[PDB]
Structure 1
């Protein structure tokens, strides 16, 4: 069955992977090569089948896992796509809607003022029309009196003479016009930069860490400072001895939150933002690298900002002392907002940390000591 040597090729030449016969395995192209039988050949096929099966199935598992991961990250990618589509719509919604609603409100206010003015002026026109009607009727009666029967025409003059003089003595009585201008666009856009702020939030205090220097009352809504007496401190798990302070109960140190408060002008102090990575005792110069950022104020006009560095920083004096501060917190890009809005309709920023040190802070604040009662400004909500 060799077709040239007539032996059924029944020997494997593992040196040459060749099916061979007597002469084919003895000489020719396989003069000194290896010879294997066909029963051992089938046996070795049966022996090497399982590992090749396992290789096939493991490659299939690899590619199946790859496809599954590709489609899973596809659904996650489109989940992010749709979610940010909806979030973008949300942002537009808030801002655009607020602006449009306020504009419609101003439109109805102007319409109401115009309607009131129109009603008043229509009443005035009705009064003057009644005056004119009286004039016309009395003058036609005057024409009659002039050209009516002789004797009584000679008589009747004095009534109308006196009435004319008296109604001339009846003197008719002898304004609020706020029209727009071109600066309104610009100042309204300034007010929109103010209006970037969102709505109110959940507001409750927590007087737990109150060192006996300040005072909190009104169901934990009103907080101010005074000097009742001078008792030493008292400590709890996270309280302090010399660094008087007070916290708020809400603690959601991720995502974004916001609200506004007022402080005003206070004689002298230093305060800032606090994280657990540093010391908490005394009025020492704390290193903001360990989560204690400082900023001191005197004269309601002079601010020195203890830098993320060695010594304090100077701040250029503003054109007006500050009045009110709004706070906004988020942690995706070190989002920290603490800005002054002297009136709640205007806004210019102050500063921010452009470096990204997360340093999870704790909501807790305090102002420096009274020093004979010069440091008593309050705070509330809403």
Structure 2
């Protein structure tokens, strides 16, 4: 093992006084010194091999292998043959004795000729190992940068999740403390108006008391003069007898009901940017009259003219789609429905045969929903039969809708109060998209389906 366990990959010197580390390794001194990079100034001097460090300040000087050691230094006979059964080089005397008296072999000259011939193949394996190690280096850089930049995206989402409600709270507190401060200004004006009034009154009253104290002993003429003057002024200020009442504030004060309604108002007012970039009539229909930037809809008393047959347009399906749709991000918009007693909403891809709303259900991804007669829901869902819902204790007025993607986050909830929305139903599952959601209003229907339909 002079060349098997006593083979330093760095030195192959005359091994004596090996340095032992807490990793469980024995090695040489300058051989290990040849490794550069990490001095104790930058930190640990860990073993690059076995995940167990050892500082140069924890010397456990153990020379066990150096004392286990004992041309050739044993026979003056140079190393002679590499064993072909043991796969080991020894010297002729040291080989025949001990190790290699009983194996199969190949002669030394032939073996070294084989090696001197095969040299470039091992060099190619060397540069191939270098190529693989650099492939792994590139994987390392790509993985580390992808991780830290995904962290960049996550911390940015954190930043925006902060910013939404942070700016909301700042704006609400500022608005309402300025409201309170303007009430302060009004009350201050009132109190200083009464201040000026009553301050003039009492100041001149005490002036009057001192003046009468002086005038109590004047001759009869000016005596009566001042008497008449004071009589007139006192009768005037008693005619100006103001019957005063208190103020009776009705300022909305911080109770402990606010939390619910204010928290709904923020739950609504969480809203990213504008979606006032309108629709596409690419499959529009006859029976409707539109206005208000082409947005408010109804029907009128003019029979509707038919349309020539076209491939994309429906046979009769009187519905509407829009223009924009993405496959990333978030979007919001707001509508109202008025007194409309029957309508329908759903969504469809490029796959269905648009001409004909015959038997066609979300079984093929032809997603449906509708309602008749005020509140009578008809939920055609992944079952050929509709379902119903609540009859709420108040009529529904507006609608508001929002889209997020990764979960197929579809959102459409009533907004009968612009301060606060009220949920109706959702389906927490994913849709690939973007295909279009489509929305339908029925015909004139004798004028019964002819009452206005709002939007902004």
TM-score by length of 1: 0.82
How many Å apart are 1:192 and its aligned residue?
2.2
CA contact under 8 A between 1:256 and 1:330: conserved in structure 2? yes
Q: Is the 8 A contact 1:305 1:312 kept in 2?
A: yes
- CA–CA distance in structure 2, aligned partners of residues 8 and 270 of structure 1: 98
Q: Is the 8 A contact 1:306 1:313 kept in 2?
A: yes
- Do 2:289 and 2:299's aligned partners in 1 also have CA atoms closer than 8 Å? yes
Q: Kindly indicate whether the alpha-carbon contact (under 8 Å) linking 1:213 and 1:225 is maintained by their aligned counterparts in 2.
A: yes
Distance 1:183 1:3 in 2: 97
Question: Residue 127 of structure 1: CA displacement?
Answer: 1.7
Provide the rounded CA distance (Å) in 2 between the counterparts of 1:6 and 1:121.
119
String of CA shifts for 1:64-120, please: whole Å, max 9, x gaps.
322321321111011101221122111211122112211111100110111112112
Q: CA 1:278/1:30 → structure 2, altered by over 3 Å: closer, same or farther?
A: same
Deviation at 1:41, TM superposition (A): 4.1
Moved more, 182-191 or 217-226: 217-226
Gap change, CA 1:284 and 1:132, over 3 Å in 2: farther
Relative distance call for 1:151 and 1:298 in structure 2 (3 A) is same
Q: What is the CA–CA distance in structure 1 between the aligned matches of 2:190 and 2:103, rounded to whole Å?
A: 124
Change (3 A) 1:90 1:36: closer
In 1: Cα distance, 2:174 partner to 2:122 partner: 76
Relative to structure 1, the CA distance from residue 305 to residue 26 in structure 2 (aligned partners, 3 Å threshold; closer, same or farther) is closer
Q: Distance in 1 between matches of 2:186 and 2:137?
A: 72
Distance 1:249 1:378, change over 3 A: farther
Within 1, Cα distance between the matches of 2:78 and 2:277? 96
Distance 1:136 1:250 in 2: 80
C-alpha contact (below 8 Å) 2:313/2:354 kept by paired residues: no
The 1:84/1:288 distance shift into structure 2, 3 A limit, reads same
Q: 1:125 to 1:299 in 2, by over 3 A?
A: farther
- Give the aligned partner of residue 10 of structure 2: none
Stretch of structure 1 that moved more, 343-352 or 161-170: 161-170
Could you report, residue by residue, the CA deviation over 1:238-285 in whole angstroms, capped at 9, with x for unpaired residues?
332311223322222322111222223312233222223334234435
Residue 289 in 1 paired to residue 356 in 2? Answer: no
The SS at the match of 2:441 is: coil
Contact 2:280–2:321 (CA<8 Å) still a contact in 1? Answer: yes
135 and 38 in structure 1: CA distance in 2 versus 1, 3 angstrom threshold: closer
Unaligned runs of 5+ in 1: none
Deviation by residue 1:303-347 (Cα, 9 ceiling, x = unmatched):
221122232112122222222221111220111111112112223
Q: 2:190 aligns with which of 109, 120, 126?
A: 120
Q: CA deviation at 1:360?
A: 3.5
How big is the shift at 1:126?
0.9
Cα pair 2:342 2:442 within 8 Å, conserved: yes
Between the aligned partners of 1:330 and 1:152, the Cα distance in structure 2 is 93
What CA distance in whole angstroms lies between the structure 1 residues aligned with 2:358 and 2:435? 19
Q: Confirm or deny that 1:178 pairs with 2:252.
A: yes
Deviates more, 1:336-345 or 1:16-25: 16-25
Contact 2:82/2:108 (8 A) holds in 1: yes
| Greater CA drift, 137-146 or 190-199 | 137-146
8 Å contact from structure 2 (residues 344, 371) kept in 1:
yes
SS in 2 for 1:250: coil
Quick one: structure 1 residues 267 and 204, their matched pair in 2 at CA, closer, same or farther if it must change by over 3 Å?
same
Contact 1:226 1:370 in 2 (8 A): yes
Q: Does the CA contact (< 8 Å) of 2:368 and 2:380 recur in 1?
A: yes
Quick one: structure 1 residues 143 and 111, their matched pair in 2 at CA, closer, same or farther if it must change by over 3 Å?
same
Q: Between 197-206 and 109-118, report the one with greater CA deviation.
A: 197-206
Helix, strand or coil for the counterpart of 2:150? helix
1:40 is paired with a residue whose SS is: helix
Q: Which 10-residue stretch deviates more, 194-203 or 266-275?
A: 194-203
Change (3 A) 1:225 1:74: farther
Inter-partner Cα distance in structure 1 for 2:93 and 2:209: 155
Change (3 A) 1:99 1:201: farther
Which region of structure 1 is more displaced relative to structure 2, 123-132 or 371-380? 371-380
Which segments of 5 or more consecutive residues in structure 2 lack a partner in the other structure? 1-70
Quick one: structure 1 residues 43 and 342, their matched pair in 2 at CA, closer, same or farther if it must change by over 3 Å? same
Q: Are the equivalent residues in 2 in contact too, given 1:325–1:341 (CA < 8 A)? A: yes
Once the two structures are TM-superposed, the CA of residue 227 in structure 1 deviates from its matched residue by: 4.4
2-structure distance, mates of 1:143, 1:41: 142
* Counterpart Cα distance in 2 of 1:323 and 1:149: 85
**Correspondence for 2:237 among 167, 174, 185:** 167
Structure 1 residue 371 displacement after superposition:
0.6
